[PDB]
Structure 1
């Protein structure tokens, strides 16, 4: 159908953050670390779906700044309940991305 085709033919990538202290810092980090991208946010109370088109990076350094306390990248898994896109993650950042353009 039209509704389903449109839903499937998206290129949205990014984190789903569960309710807690990482929601606003991640939204802010997504905005700062992807300045050429529009960041969209869907708030479902128990979680927030944060996305950009094609690629969305969260750097540890920016997230630590926005969270306001010392932060390692691996700790994001306490609050990363899901994500859209493929993931590449290291000590410095997490990258959500797609290989294809749909």
Structure 2
């Protein structure tokens, strides 16, 4: 249960983005909007698991810039296949985050 313990004791939060035109822009956005956080990316081809420690923010303004076309925050749902963390979403950004620290 060492393996299982270690797996459980993580604070990774962030979007799982399905294969498509949002993958690269969301990775770039995670990097830009969370400076001083390391962004991790696990590529499973059909989806990409993007994470930071404790909290990861995606702003609409930055995603729109990285995507290269007009973008409303609600459209992220088209490609947000899952996520780690609790979610706090509005017209301006989405925040993935944990209340606890494991």
Is the structural similarity TM-score above 0.5?
yes
Alpha-carbon RMSD across the aligned residues, in angstroms, is 0.2
Q: Which runs of 5+ in 1 are unaligned?
A: none
Report the 3-state secondary structure (helix = DSSP H, G, I; strand = E; otherwise coil) of the residue aligned with 1:63.
helix
Q: How many residue pairs align between the two structures?
A: 102
Runs of 4+ in structure 1 displaced over 4 angstroms? none
Paired residues for 1:7-86 under 5 Å? 7-86=7-86
1:36 CA drift (Å): 1.1
TM-score (norm 2): 1.00
Q: Deviations over 1:19-47 (max 9, x none)?
A: 00000000000000000100000000000
Matched with 2:96 is 96
Q: Which runs of 5+ in 2 are unaligned?
A: none
Q: Quick one: distance in 1 between partners of 2:93 and 2:40?
A: 20
TM-score (norm 1): 1.00
1:71 CA drift (Å): 0.1
